[PDB]
Design a protein around this ligand. Structure first.
Ligand SMILES: CCCCCCCCCCCCCCCCCC(=O)OC[C@H](COP(=O)([O-])OCC[N+](C)(C)C)OC(=O)CCCCCCCCCCCCCCCCC
Ligand SMILES: CCCCCCCCCCCCCCCCCC(=O)OC[C@H](COP(=O)([O-])OCC[N+](C)(C)C)OC(=O)CCCCCCCCCCCCCCCCC
Ligand SMILES: NC(=O)C1=CN([C@@H]2O[C@H](COP(=O)(O)OP(=O)(O)OC[C@H]3O[C@@H](n4cnc5c(N)ncnc54)[C@H](OP(=O)(O)O)[C@@H]3O)[C@@H](O)[C@H]2O)C=CC1
Ligand code: SF4
Ligand code: SF4
Ligand code: SF4
Ligand SMILES: [Zn+2]
Lengths: 144, 114, 156, 342, 178, 207, 94
């Protein structure tokens, strides 16, 4: 009956990630055994998938890297790791992934995406950008 | 001249209300210090009550005095009940602000204030 | 083996239990708390991360200061913050709570809850998207993930 | 005089006072109040810390946007001190612990570190350097802590002349280790004392008076090579002081004699605990050392701070030791202690 | 036109069957077992929850989030120090102190935004006549200290050498509405 | 024809204008300067001593059943000697009309309360006092409703600075929330936006 | 095009740096002073000077509505080259 059909789909998910070790790397790391079409990959390592059958919101997902900039992000995975060209697609702002519709290239757009930094070094520290407004008087260097 | 009265025929009559409000506070300092755990002793609490009155002892308009008394009773109502907590009652004592100086030379040394 | 190594694993154990059981306090002041409910709503369930709302400060680990903090309320917020047993965390949410926000220049708004409670993470926005607060909660969880409290104890 | 350092404003937050300061004991008990009085006015306090970033959390108050900068360091490891005392104008060294740890002796917390802070500050080019010792810091002393501070006080001055050596008496405060100590003797049925506390005189000083003194020590043009002694008034007798603590903390009072040799060995037992010990052989001797007179030193009055009597600011700390049926009692019902000029 | 919500139509009409229907209702909790039925249905439904870190909820091109100072394709800064984004900002979050750039152009020497004062209202991007300041989709930039939310021109150009691959597509897909 | 300009239903201007005169000659002892605006809304100015008779009349009278007190505001105008211009907006639910009643006041010239007539005033009635310092007679409770328990001020007065005179912060020396004089980190930037040209010639004021 | 000041600090495109003796440098200790390395003076100069046929040439950002307001330059000068006021582009004739 239909119960065999769904139990057959479960076998596909549990045995559709290369092997056992492949299942482990995603089950405890993403809590999502689903499998869908591989739309593309980043230069950092992020893998983007899509499954049109599922409902809105759950039909596009990432499997993040294990390392982005010498960070060891196997566990410490945060949302600020999707590069801009995919952040548009992953958030359902467009139907076209950057694999088929590449972003316009410019000589000043960042090549290496930088995740959010809040407590690690290489942190943002605000400062004033204007120069001095009042110049003091320098006295003569010799008496009288 | 020719201004309508508010709870005061003349200054002397309005001075009785102030004396009535003072008797309401002097009887009240020993109950707030205990009802809400204040770090002050009753002797110095009554001093602040008296001090807040000498701040306004130079006024002579009957209408103004009545409004001062009306506000004081409201200030007393919020203290009779514990509507205003230890944070609000201890706000009068100014236990944190640096004592602003009076000597001109001290003012001249720090800041551009007159 | 070294005694330091065992210490860190215990440090990571105590931190882990404090990461996956982060109970906030039903303390939404105004107008960000509507998006603090959406965080509790079906789409962005907080029970996923073992995050459960509890009314009593005595049983709350984190305090989400969401909404404008006014002078009349300032004494109450500090009192509630004091009641939370340590270790406790504060997650300032929204512009009104981070700084003064839209009411920075009003006469009855404390310009940011950082003046009254020590804030651990600031979630910008007005209101922050339910994801923006969830990124804040997760970024708070990664803060506990690196405490080093038992590791320093061996060094004392 | 860089234009940034010049003082500005009416005094308070969001102001400038030109008191860029490196406080090396901010996480402690006296450091909390020193930073507060620096941060209450306009001062950029650099707070070196080795603790958890959680234990320094409470210090992110009492200072406007970016008036605090937290840096990590290790006392043994050089080149982390210089990185913190580089741009500062005044360095306030409050480092001090009342017991030995596995890594740090008293020599390594009262003599070595102040030398490293002092040497790293003179080379850096600071103007002042405020140091804290104890009033009973005589070389000819009995406590291991007091004697070490005596050497550290001399060694700090030799490396860094024109230092300000502050010598507070036993400091009492909210999270202190003086009134919160005797008040905690209730957990044992009685309060052991040496010679019932007679022949011992204490001159407690309030923290805010001490921190006001430290904060005004980085302003007053004089007091650049002087040695102070913040003692406070009302030299009580230890029996009368502890009897008064239980007067506010309406518990009991059952003093009894106890030789100092037994009362030290028992104290030495509590010093074996890996955590913060309750008592130690060194803390037994400090509590039972008569405080010298302040005659030959300037003191608080010569610096612009009014000493605060114990009776005024004792209920703030001893309220939490009361129980219900005595939590609401006031200062009036205590018959305060008797001062002794002995 | 009104509508009665809790007004009985006609009453005083009950027989044994109607009487026993109410007895059965009250005396066997029929309308409470009816409420249980709905919750039981909901258990057998797919939860709406989405794994936030791995699948992120939907947005729109007009979304208003982190700020960003844009540049022309050549590389030149768009902002020309016209200073009417701080005229309309209803929180006085923006400050500008522009001076001539020594090559003749009118450019800014300070463009600091206080993200703790900002209310993400979008008036500054619709006031700018060169699209110099925009608001990219970055809603996730929470920090661990108040200071990193006080953005300055250097941060705002970094956010703008980063999200242009996104910001350009968003503007290119809603500028016709504007 | 003119999609921009609002349609003008001049019928409701005549009805209001007739009623304003009807109220004017049925209560002459207090009524002053009844007027009707372009936007068809009536406006009656009343001597402050006549607040109760006018408000009681406009509620009970059969032809004026203004039973709902929409709000009780107050406009501060330092120009005029009687600064505070208390406003009463009223609603009918019978004749489907709104009527405004205005009186003047002063920081030393209180006004009689209305809680006897409209209980809705009660909270609005304190809000004016808390915000403008306009004492009201015969009120039951009359305490601050909005401001903190320790404001020695009246925020909505035009002579009150926007940032206020006091700020709250937490202090460890005293272990409670304390109050200190305000020192803003970035001063409020007052924008001088007024144009120097006569936008509306219909409101010219000759010298 | 970022140059380091003698104190080792990085100068921004607005020419700012903190002196070696300024106390405000503390904020950068254990952190970094982010500066945008894509300067605006240098990038705009690397563009070629366009040559047109008319003596009056329009300039907009290029995309029309995505550029800057429509302006008109005068190219009668021969010693200098006309510059658009919004974007730093340049135009000549001949
Ligand atoms: C007491 C006996 C041990 C009880 C079991 C505790 C196991 C804790 C655990 O499951 O850690 C998994 C966790 C799983 O990672 P995590 O849950 O902490 O990190 C977050 C995971 N994502 C990204 C999916 C949200 O392992 C660790 O993080 C390392 C710390 C382990 C500490 C215990 C060491 C022994
Ligand atoms: C999985 C397990 C499922 C258990 C069943 C859960 C209820 C499912 C909802 C059914 C439903 O929709 O009912 C609608 C209806 C709603 O009724 P109604 O409100 O529309 O009534 C209309 C008018 N009258 C009253 C005249 C019919 O309820 C029922 O069909 C059944 C109501 C009677 C149930 C009596 C239960 C008594 C329980 C005690 C007996 C022991 C039970 C065994 C204990 C073990
Ligand atoms: N009764 C008193 O309190 C008296 C105090 N004093 C002096 O006051 C100063 C501080 O008083 P108090 O604050 O009450 O004592 P605390 O122990 O409360 O202050 C300890 C401070 O010193 C730091 N510290 C201690 N040992 C080391 C170390 N080995 N390496 C680095 N940092 C260290 C602590 O850092 P962490 O928090 O990481 O331990 C903490 O910041 C001391 O110098 C003491 O001698 C003088 C007379 C008596
Ligand atoms: S920050 Fe915005 S959303 Fe949050 S409380 Fe303030 S106004 Fe409301
Ligand atoms: S989004 Fe609104 S509040 Fe924020 S900077 Fe722009 S104009 Fe100001
Ligand atoms: S960002 Fe735009 S509106 Fe603001 S000053 Fe620059 S050009 Fe003008
Ligand atoms: Zn151009």
């Amino acid at each position: 009956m239909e119960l065999v059909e769904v139990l057959k789909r479960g076998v596909q998910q549990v045995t559709g990630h290369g092997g056992l070790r492949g299942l482990l790397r995603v089950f405890f790391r993403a809590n999502d055994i689903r499998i869908g079409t591989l739309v593309g990959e980043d230069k950092y390592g992020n893998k983007y998938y899509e499954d049109n059958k599922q409902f809105f919101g759950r039909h596009r997902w990432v499997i993040y890297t294990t390392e982005m900039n010498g960070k060891n992000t196997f566990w410490d995975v945060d949302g600020s790791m999707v590069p801009p060209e995919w952040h548009r697609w992953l958030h359902c702002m467009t139907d076209d992934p950057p694999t088929t519709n590449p972003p316009t290239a410019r000589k000043f757009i960042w090549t290496n995406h930088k995740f959010n930094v809040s407590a690690t070094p290489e942190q943002y520290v605000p400062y004033s950008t204007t120069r001095k407004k009042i110049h003091e008087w320098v006295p003569p260097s010799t008496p009288y | 001249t020719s201004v309508k009265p508010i709870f005061s025929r003349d200054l002397n009559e309005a001075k009785r209300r102030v004396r009535e409000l003072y008797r309401a506070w002097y009887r009240e300092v020993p109950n707030t210090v205990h009802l809400m755990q204040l770090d002050i002793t009753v002797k110095q609490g009554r001093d602040k009550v008296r001090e807040m009155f000498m701040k306004n002892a130079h006024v002579t308009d009957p209408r103004v005095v009545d409004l001062l008394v009306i506000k004081g009773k409201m200030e007393l109502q919020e203290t009779i009940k514990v509507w205003k907590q230890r944070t609000h009652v201890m706000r009068f004592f100014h236990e944190t602000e640096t004592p602003r100086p009076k000597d001109f030379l001290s003012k001249f040394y720090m800041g551009h204030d007159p | 083996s070294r005694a330091e190594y065992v210490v860190t694993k215990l440090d990571d154990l105590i931190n882990w239990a404090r990461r996956s059981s982060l109970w906030p306090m039903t303390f939404g002041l105004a107008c960000c708390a509507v998006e603090m409910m959406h965080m509790a709503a079906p789409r962005y369930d907080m029970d996923r991360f073992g995050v459960v709302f509890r009314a009593s400060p005595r049983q709350a680990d984190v305090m989400i200061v969401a909404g404008t903090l006014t002078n009349k309320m300032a004494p109450a917020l500090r009192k509630v913050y004091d009641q939370m047993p340590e270790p406790r965390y504060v997650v300032s949410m929204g512009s009104c709570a981070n700084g003064g926000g839209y009411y920075h220049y009003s006469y009855s708004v404390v310009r940011g809850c950082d003046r009254i409670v020590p804030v651990d993470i600031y979630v910008p926005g007005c209101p922050p998207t339910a994801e923006a607060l969830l990124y804040g909660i997760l970024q708070l969880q990664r803060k506990i993930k690196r405490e080093q409290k038992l590791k320093i104890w061996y060094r004392r | 005089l860089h234009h940034a350092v010049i003082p500005h404003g009416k005094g308070g937050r969001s102001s400038v006072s030109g008191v860029v300061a490196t406080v090396f004991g901010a996480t402690g008990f006296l450091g909390r109040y020193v930073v507060n009085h620096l941060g209450r006015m306009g001062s950029q306090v650099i707070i070196p810390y080795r603790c958890d970033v959680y234990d320094i959390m409470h210090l992110r108050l009492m200072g406007d946007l970016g008036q605090l900068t937290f840096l990590e360091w290790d006392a043994r490891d050089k080149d982390s001190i210089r990185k913190a005392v580089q741009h500062s104008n005044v360095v306030i060294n409050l480092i001090g612990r009342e017991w030995e740890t596995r890594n740090f002796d008293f020599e390594d917390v009262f003599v070595n570190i102040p030398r490293a802070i002092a040497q790293a500050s003179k080379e850096a080019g600071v103007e002042r350097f405020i140091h804290v010792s104890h009033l009973n810091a005589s070389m000819k002393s009995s406590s291991k802590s007091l004697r070490s501070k005596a050497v550290g006080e001399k060694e700090v001055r030799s490396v860094f002349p024109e230092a300000i050596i502050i010598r507070p008496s036993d400091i009492f405060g909210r999270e202190d280790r003086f009134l919160n100590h005797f008040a905690n003797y209730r957990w044992f049925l009685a309060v052991p004392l040496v010679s019932l506390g007679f022949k011992t005189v204490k001159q407690p000083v309030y923290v805010a008076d001490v921190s006001k003194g430290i904060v005004n020590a980085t302003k007053d043009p004089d007091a650049v090579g002087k040695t102070f002694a913040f003692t406070g008034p009302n030299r009580y007798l230890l029996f009368h002081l502890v009897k008064y603590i239980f007067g506010m903390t309406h518990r009991t009072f059952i003093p009894y004699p106890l030789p100092l040799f037994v009362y030290s060995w028992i104290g030495k037992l509590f010093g074996l605990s890996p955590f913060e010990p309750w008592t130690t052989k060194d803390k037994v001797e400090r509590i039972h050392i008569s405080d010298v007179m302040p005659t030959d030193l300037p003191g608080l009055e010569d610096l612009g701070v009014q000493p605060t009597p114990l009776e005024l600011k004792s209920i703030e700390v001893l309220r939490r030791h009361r129980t219900y049926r005595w939590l609401s009692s006031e200062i009036e019902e205590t018959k305060p202690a008797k001062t002794v000029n002995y | 036109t009104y509508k009665y919500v809790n007004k009985k139509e006609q009453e005083s009409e009950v027989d044994m069957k109607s009487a026993t229907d109410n007895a059965a209702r009250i005396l066997m909790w029929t309308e409470l077992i009816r409420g249980l039925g709905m919750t039981l249905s909901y258990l057998f439904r797919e939860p709406a929850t989405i794994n936030y870190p791995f699948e992120k909820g939907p947005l729109s091109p007009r979304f208003r989030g982190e700020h960003a100072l844009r540049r022309y394709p050549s590389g030149e800064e768009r902002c020309i120090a016209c200073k009417l984004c701080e005229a309309i900002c209803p929180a006085q979050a923006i400050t500008i102190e522009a001076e001539p750039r020594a090559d003749g152009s009118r450019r800014t020497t300070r463009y600091d935004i206080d993200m703790t004062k900002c209310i993400y209202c979008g008036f500054c991007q619709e006031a700018c006549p060169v699209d110099a300041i925009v608001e990219g989709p970055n809603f996730e930039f929470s920090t661990e200290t108040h200071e990193e939310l006080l953005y300055n021109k250097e941060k705002l150009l970094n956010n703008g050498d980063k999200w242009e691959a996104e910001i350009a597509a968003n503007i290119q897909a809603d500028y016709l509405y504007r | 024809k003119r999609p921009t300009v609002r349609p003008r239903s001049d019928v409701t201007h005549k009805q209001l204008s007739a009623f304003g005169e009807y109220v004017a000659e049925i209560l002459p002892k207090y009524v002053q300067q009844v007027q009707v605006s372009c936007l068809d809304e009536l406006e009656i100015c009343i001597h402050p001593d006549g607040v109760i008779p006018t408000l009681t009349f406009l509620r009970d009278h059969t032809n004026a059943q203004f039973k709902s007190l929409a709000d009780l505001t107050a406009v501060d105008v330092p120009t005029r000697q009687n600064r505070f211009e208390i406003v009463y907006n009223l609603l009918s639910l019978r004749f489907n009309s709104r009527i405004r009643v205005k009186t003047y006041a002063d920081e030393l010239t209180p006004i009689d309360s209305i809680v006897s007539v409209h209980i809705a005033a009660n909270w609005y009635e304190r809000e004016v006092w808390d915000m403008f310092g306009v004492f009201f007679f015969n009120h039951p409770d009359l305490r601050r409703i909005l401001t903190d328990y320790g404001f020695e001020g009246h925020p909505f007065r035009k002579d009150f600075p926007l940032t206020g005179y006091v700020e709250l912060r937490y202090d460890d020396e005293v272990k409670r929330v304390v109050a200190e004089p305000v020192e803003l980190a970035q001063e409020f930037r007052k924008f001088d936006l007024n144009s120097p040209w006569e936008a509306f010639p219909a409101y010219r004021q000759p010298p | 095009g970022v140059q380091v000041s003698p104190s080792g600090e990085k100068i921004t495109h607005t020419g700012q740096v903190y002196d070696e003796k300024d106390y405000r440098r503390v904020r950068f200790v254990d952190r970094q002073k982010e500066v945008n390395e894509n300067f605006a003076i240098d990038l705009i100069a690397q563009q070629p000077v366009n040559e047109v046929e008319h003596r009056i040439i329009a300039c907009d950002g290029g995309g029309g509505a995505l550029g800057h307001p429509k302006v008109y330059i005068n190219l009668d000068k021969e010693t200098k080259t006309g510059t658009c006021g919004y974007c730093g582009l340049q135009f000549k004739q001949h």
